[PDB]
Write a protein that binds this ligand. Structure first.
Ligand SMILES: Cc1cc2nc3c(=O)[nH]c(=O)nc-3n(C[C@H](O)[C@H](O)[C@H](O)COP(=O)(O)OP(=O)(O)OC[C@H]3O[C@@H](n4cnc5c(N)ncnc54)[C@H](O)[C@@H]3O)c2cc1C
Length: 309
């Protein structure tokens, strides 16, 4: 049974909001909560941040918020810090189902000397640590929203959406899937196939796993979910198990879905992409197809959606 969301006037806009707040005059939002998403064996912390924007900074699923961390820009004296962008991990209604909050999925960027292993906090990532160090009531300078690459194509409510994430790249897909399955959105009744592939380092590094597993039990004919755990699993050619390796386990199903018009999405750190391309090229070759020609047609058909960073 789908969760009631409000206010339904968030469905009325026909275009996504863009640059509602700009860096020189951000919106001062308020932290609701910060929690770690990961267990003790995870190589680093990733946190879920809930931000009260008061309904002043609405967005569509797949967009990003900008955050301006405090302090001076180290490269421009007297100037504010540069915006850092974060894929929004919530639906437009947010985790409180009220249209007032949005959420981020933030990996702490921590510096370690490559030899001594000693941490150096002075070289840690500024905005990511600022966010994961935040507490209820803290203020955040919010900009945006921005981005259109990862908007969800809703013209066909029975479309197929193949979602390929590593790490924090799961963020837009958390939003897609809540809109598809969790929330009572009368004007978007999804009856297609949503297929999430997620690569992380180990079980303790999984993000939102209980939520995704719940969809398998609630929507077994509309949702599929496959995981790759790089430090705990090995591919058939015995490298570490990466998200491209799990795609290959479903080579024929995936290529048939693409040929049938499926959308495919990639999100996360950009290092995930060269290997995914290598696997797709090899899968195509085994089928007697040219991956170059296939990718050109997927791009021409607007089926190929990549936001990596
Ligand atoms: C569209 C988009 C969406 C994104 N979505 C997400 C998301 O959902 N989640 C997420 O976590 N990130 C996301 N990012 C990345 C995010 O914008 C930031 O780049 C990231 O959080 C790091 O920012 P920071 O301020 O913490 O690090 P910065 O302060 O910008 O530092 C960058 C890196 O340099 C390192 N560093 C700094 N000084 C030194 C030094 N002297 N020597 C060596 N190393 C040094 C830091 O440790 C860090 O790793 C996204 C990016 C884009 C473009």
């Amino acid at each position: 049974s789908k969760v009631s969301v409000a206010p339904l006037h968030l469905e009325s806009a026909k275009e996504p909001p863009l640059n509602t707040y700009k860096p020189k005059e951000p919106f001062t939002a308020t932290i609701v909560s910060v929690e770690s998403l990961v267990g003790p064996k995870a190589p680093g912390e990733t946190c879920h941040i809930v931000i009260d924007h008061g309904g002043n900074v609405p967005y569509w699923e797949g967009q990003s918020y900008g955050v301006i961390p405090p302090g001076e820009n180290p490269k421009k004296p007297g100037a504010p810090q540069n915006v850092r962008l974060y894929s929004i991990a919530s639906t437009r209604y947010g985790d409180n189902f009220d249209g007032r909050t949005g959420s981020l999925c933030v990996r702490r960027a921590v510096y370690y000397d490559p030899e001594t292993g000693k941490e150096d906090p002075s070289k840690n990532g500024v905005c990511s640590n600022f966010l994961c160090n935040s507490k209820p009531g803290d203020k955040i300078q919010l900009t945006g929203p921005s981005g259109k690459i990862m908007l969800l194509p809703e013209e066909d409510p029975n479309a197929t959406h193949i979602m390929i994430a590593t790490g924090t790249g799961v963020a837009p897909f958390r939003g897609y899937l809540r809109r598809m399955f969790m929330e009572d959105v009368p004007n978007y009744r999804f009856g297609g196939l949503a297929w999430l592939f997620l690569g992380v380092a180990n079980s303790d590094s999984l993000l939102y796993d209980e939520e995704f597993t719940s969809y398998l039990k609630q929507y077994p004919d509309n949702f599929r979910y496959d995981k790759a755990l790089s430090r705990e699993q090995k591919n058939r050619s015995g490298g570490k198990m990466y998200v491209q390796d799990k795609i290959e386990e479903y080579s024929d199903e995936i290529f048939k879905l693409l040929d049938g018009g499926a959308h495919i999405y990639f999100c996360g750190l950009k290092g995930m992409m060269p290997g995914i391309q290598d696997t797709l090229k090899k899968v195509a070759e085994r089928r007697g197809e040219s991956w170059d020609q296939k990718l050109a047609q997927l791009k021409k058909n607007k089926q190929w959606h990549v936001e990596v960073y």
